[PDB]
């Protein structure tokens, strides 16, 4: 439908208080120092030191 | 004469309880609602009513709080 009365600006801010994403993971890479994500590849090209990607 | 009649937002189970039936299941909400019947709808209404700790026995859980032993308060 459509709204009768406008949702407030502060009501909008309070409603949008839970649109943000959830927390993420952190992982230490032993060979190439970086705080990457869990079961992801770092910018150094390695998932947990398996050289599986290029430099970029 | 005085039964106890209640109807929340739920429908189809309108609660009508006799005096002897109240003694079988629950008795604290009796005095709870009786006292809250003298409380205006405000911020501390349901906060004022919790100060009326309704018990069916002579003891209470707040004996460690130094209760004033008296009668008819």
């Amino acid at each position: 439908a459509v709204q009768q009365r406008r949702s407030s600006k502060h009501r909008r801010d309070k409603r949008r208080s839970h649109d943000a994403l959830t927390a993420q993971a952190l992982s230490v890479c032993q060979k190439c120092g970086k705080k990457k994500l869990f079961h992801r590849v770092c910018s150094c090209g390695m998932y947990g030191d398996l050289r599986v990607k290029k430099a970029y | 004469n005085e039964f106890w009649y209640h109807h929340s937002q739920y429908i189809g189970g309108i609660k009508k309880v006799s005096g002897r039936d109240m003694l079988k299941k629950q008795s604290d909400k009796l005095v709870y609602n009786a006292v809250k019947g003298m409380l205006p709808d405000n911020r501390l209404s349901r906060r004022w009513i919790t100060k009326v700790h309704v018990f069916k026995g002579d003891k209470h859980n707040m004996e460690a709080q130094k209760p004033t032993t008296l009668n008819w308060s």
Partner: protein
């Protein structure tokens, strides 16, 4: 609504899966979507464990599952798989390919993955 972009239809999905498995057989590794990468790994493992016989029967059967690409066509991918890809990894019970998770996409932040062939 009515007629518009078809999208990911079942026929299109299976054709894309065939194209991706042919691409991972030709180029070796493929950077694609994680859900597509895992299906491609599954099909590649099935093809590797099917091609250990190296007979015309598997040629005809896999003929319905490979789609030609830039480098390799269907019957050249046949010989490629039957010669080097399948026998190289048959020494182990499974694990003919590995999928690893990558970062998101620039414009659409799509979680991607990389699929490689290994023992």
């Amino acid at each position: 609504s009515y007629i518009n972009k078809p999208g990911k239809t079942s026929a299109w999905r299976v054709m894309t899966v065939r194209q991706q498995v042919s691409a991972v057989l030709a180029y070796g590794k493929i950077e694609t979507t994680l859900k597509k990468a895992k299906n491609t790994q599954k099909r590649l493992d099935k093809l590797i464990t099917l091609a250990k016989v190296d007979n015309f029967n598997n040629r005809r059967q896999v003929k319905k599952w490979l789609l030609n690409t830039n480098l390799f066509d269907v019957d050249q991918l046949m010989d490629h798989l039957f010669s080097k890809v399948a026998p190289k990894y048959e020494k182990t019970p499974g694990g003919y390919s590995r999928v690893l998770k990558l970062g998101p996409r620039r414009g659409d932040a799509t979680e991607m993955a990389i699929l490689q062939l290994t023992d």
